[PDB]
Ligand SMILES: [Zn+2]
């Protein structure tokens with residue numbers, strides 16, 4: 116998967132707004148929180164337009180592996 120170069124708990128309020136583009140706050144394009152973790156993403160980047168409705172649940176790439184019996 117992708118890798119990280121930097122990051123820290125400081126900047127955007129609770130609502131986690133992150134995307135490949137590089138947005139940290141509501142720019143203007145509709146977004147949706149990942150039912151899995153709870154991160155707002157660009158409904159467009161993910162591949163969705165206002166035209167169609169929103170998916171009951173949307174999981175991110177990080178969740179794909181996050182989801183598990185892993186107690187720790
Ligand atoms: Zn984006």
Ligand SMILES: [Zn+2]
Pocket residue numbers: 149150151152153154174175176177178
């Ligand atoms: Zn997620």
